[PDB]
Amino acid sequence: CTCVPPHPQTAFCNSDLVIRAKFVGTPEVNQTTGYQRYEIKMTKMYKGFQALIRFVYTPASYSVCGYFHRSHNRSEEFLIAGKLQDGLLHITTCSFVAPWNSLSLAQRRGFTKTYTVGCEECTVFPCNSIPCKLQSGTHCLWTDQLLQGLEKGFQSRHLACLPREPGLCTWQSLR
Amino acid sequence: FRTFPGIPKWRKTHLTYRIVNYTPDLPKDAVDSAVEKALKVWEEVTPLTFSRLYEGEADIMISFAVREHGDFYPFDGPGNVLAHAYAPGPGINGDAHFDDDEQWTKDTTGTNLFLVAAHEIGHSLGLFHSANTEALMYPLYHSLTDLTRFRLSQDDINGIQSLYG
Ligand SMILES: [Ca+2]
Ligand SMILES: [Ca+2]
Ligand SMILES: [Ca+2]
Ligand SMILES: [Cl-]
Ligand SMILES: [Zn+2]
Ligand SMILES: [Zn+2]
Structure with a gap:
């Protein structure tokens, strides 16, 4: 597996x-x-x-x-x-x-409150390699593993893929 | 068997494998190359040797499938689970299944078939997951900067050697 x-x-x-x-x-x-x-x-x-x-x-x-x-x-x-x-x-x-x-406090705020904001429109896209391809404005490219971060990576522990406007999601702080 | 509870291992050094179906993601020659390189990874460390069958039932049946495909463990579409395999034994045991909702590649751009296949073949030889993030039997997919310097870790070597010598 x-x-x-x-x-x-x-x-x-x-x-x-x-x-x-x-x-x-x-x-x-x-x-x-x-x-x-x-x-x-x-x-x-x-x-x-x-x-x-x-x-x-x-x-x-x-x-x-x-x-x-x-x-x-x-x-x-x-x-x-x-x-x-x-x-x-x-x-x-x-x-x-x-x-x-x-879990980080940001991750706890995500599960309790914030993550649901990005569910309707946003998408965390996993990047296996660089160059990574972004498929639409509602995708946030997750690059923690390519920086060797894994579960503890900065984007997973402090950022959520949230919308800034219709058709555009970016990484955003959770605090 | 002489030992109980039993050792998850093939009771024979020489095993057979067959690539029953293929993924459209790659040329079929690339599928075979990835598979036999994944088998070589274990061949050069153990007494095991592998013969490719093209019909019938082989010890290690390699199949690409999406979602439900006839076992107890359906695939989950793109992402998450990329593949699974079975411990040695008869029937479905020893087989490796690869989620084709992923896109398999010869290089490390997408999901490298050789990397995943080498891991799942490890399971098919009787190996469990490793806690060492550098080990091939680590469950989480780790794309490498270049497959040129892919090395079997000592944990993987010792595990497969304690099974087969
Ligand atoms: Ca999957
Ligand atoms: Ca089998
Ligand atoms: Ca595919
Ligand atoms: Cl025995
Ligand atoms: Zn595994
Ligand atoms: Zn399966």
């Missing part, structure tokens, strides 16, 4: 559910579906109100993009941005799942 992880804004705008939750207990694998699930205690919901959430589902193995929880602290709150499939919350290795406290 090879992933191009999404910008936190893209994760918020493409995920049906965005929640804070604590992972409780080990995962249970079912080979009939090919999926495991982790029991979770949801503490806060930012998206996906129509689904009211006790379990999160993901592929059974690493190689098909299964999410494997590495944290041992049961009290640790995690932001989960996932997809609703058959009323079940699904995540993968690519999915934006991160410790809530490990």
Whole structure:
């Protein structure tokens, strides 16, 4: 499984559910579906109100993009941005799942308030290489990885792709 | 098997692979070149050797597909998941599937087929993901400034050597 992880804004705008939750207990694998699930205690919901959430589902193995929880602290709150499939919350290795406290304050303001402003019109476009091609004015080119930033890159941790006017989105501060 | 729980590995040094379908993103010769270079990456470090089949069922079935394609794990369109593979074993096990909603390239402009294929073939040989960001078995795609100096990391070497020698 090879992933191009999404910008936190893209994760918020493409995920049906965005929640804070604590992972409780080990995962249970079912080979009939090919999926495991982790029991979770949801503490806060930012998206996906129509689904009211006790379990999160993901592929059974690493190689098909299964999410494997590495944290041992049961009290640790995690932001989960996932997809609703058959009323079940699904995540993968690519999915934006991160410790809530490990996020920057700008990222927390994004999930709580700001990211939804850029969902309707803007698009974070991932740049695999330089020169990078910009496909429209509503695209913001994400260059964190080419600067070796990854998850901690400046654009993912402090900037949102927000509209300045109809037909034009640019990177903008979140504070 | 003599050890239990079992080692995710092929119980044979010589394996077969077949490129069943192709992506329109590239010439078919470029698809094959990327695949056999991805297999060479593991061949020069291990006793494994690979033979290409053109019909029938091979150990490692390489397929391009979009979204739903007959397994439990549908693709997610452009972005995110670029490909997945299966641990060694019969049937779908050992196969590698590549999301064609990505655009595959010979160079590092778009999504380099060789880089992803070498990772997924690692999974097909029995390797798990690495925590080392420099390792090929790192799950997140890392485009390189030039494929000229692509190196297999020591973590990848040791993992594949502990499996096959
Ligand atoms: Ca994809
Ligand atoms: Ca197979
Ligand atoms: Ca394509
Ligand atoms: Cl054995
Ligand atoms: Zn992988
Ligand atoms: Zn597949």
